[PDB]
Design a protein around this ligand. Sequence first.
Ligand SMILES: *[C@@H]1O[C@H](CO)[C@@H](O[C@@H]2O[C@H](CO)[C@@H](O[C@@H]3O[C@H](CO[C@H]4O[C@H](CO)[C@@H](O)[C@H](O)[C@@H]4O)[C@@H](O)[C@H](O[C@H]4O[C@H](CO)[C@@H](O)[C@H](O)[C@@H]4O)[C@@H]3O)[C@H](O)[C@H]2NC(C)=O)[C@H](O)[C@H]1NC(C)=O
Ligand SMILES: CNC(=O)[C@@H](NC(=O)[C@H](CC(C)C)[C@H](O)C(=O)NO)C(C)(C)C
Ligand SMILES: [Ca+2]
Ligand SMILES: [Cl-]
Ligand SMILES: [Cl-]
Ligand SMILES: [Zn+2]
Length: 203
Amino acid sequence: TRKYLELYIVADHTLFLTRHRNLQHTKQRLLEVANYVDQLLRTLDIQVALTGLEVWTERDRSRVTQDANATLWAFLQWRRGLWAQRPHDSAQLLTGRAFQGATVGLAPVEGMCRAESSGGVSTDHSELPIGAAATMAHEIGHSLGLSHDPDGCCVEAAAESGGCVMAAATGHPFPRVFSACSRRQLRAFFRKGGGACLSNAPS
Ligand SMILES: *[C@@H]1O[C@H](CO)[C@@H](O[C@@H]2O[C@H](CO)[C@@H](O[C@@H]3O[C@H](CO[C@H]4O[C@H](CO)[C@@H](O)[C@H](O)[C@@H]4O)[C@@H](O)[C@H](O[C@H]4O[C@H](CO)[C@@H](O)[C@H](O)[C@@H]4O)[C@@H]3O)[C@H](O)[C@H]2NC(C)=O)[C@H](O)[C@H]1NC(C)=O
Ligand SMILES: CNC(=O)[C@@H](NC(=O)[C@H](CC(C)C)[C@H](O)C(=O)NO)C(C)(C)C
Ligand SMILES: [Ca+2]
Ligand SMILES: [Cl-]
Ligand SMILES: [Cl-]
Ligand SMILES: [Zn+2]
């Protein structure tokens, strides 16, 4: 019984523009962010399989604004049509837009595999790909029913180590591991029936 996450990642038009309208380099950024997401999720014993990749080179397919929540749900609605053509477990939007309130990412809680909510949004806020990846892994965490780490969690992964992924705030150094509290919450989530779509090994 092994767990696999079929991930579909999207780069919005703004990100494309910040990447000098360079398709190849925008795709490379997505690939490197996806690689770090895989590294982080593997500390939960979940392997990531990059199912698909998309760059909105001419226009955003869903409305992206300063409102993180509005952006998240507009993306999720668009994701429904995407899913019908390109099946995946979770779709993640990586945006070059900055959200109001210093928010860098959002995702519906316990929505993994749900038709209306299996996705998330993250701003590419750091020069380092691991920044966006830690945010994306955090949103995927919420999708898997993980809550923010209580202060008595993340016994170790010291300050200089970046801490743990489910921390409520982010910043360099970025987290590379999920806390033991997160591990326990994930196992309970799976036992209770959540994330049923993570059971298949990608073809
Ligand atoms: C993040 O952003 C999302 C999207 O904007 C918010 O989700 C919306 O939340 C509101 C309130 O919770 C929901 O409003 C309900 O809409 C129902 C009809 O929905 C249709 O129309 C909306 C708007 O055009 C579309 O988004 C949607 O796809 C549907 O086509 C109404 O029937 C509801 O009214 C009835 O129920 C309410 C509450 O139960 C009663 O008080 C009323 O008397 C009435 O009987 C209600 O107006 C809306 O549907 C949600 N949109 C979704 C699911 O996409 C999040 O709340 C927001 N998160 C935040 C800010 O925390
Ligand atoms: C640099 N900005 C931040 O640290 C913000 N935090 C976020 O944006 C969170 C995501 C980070 C990946 C931890 C977000 O609120 C969340 O929990 N989504 O699930 C602050 C603390 C300013 C609100
Ligand atoms: Ca799957
Ligand atoms: Cl168990
Ligand atoms: Cl049980
Ligand atoms: Zn959070």
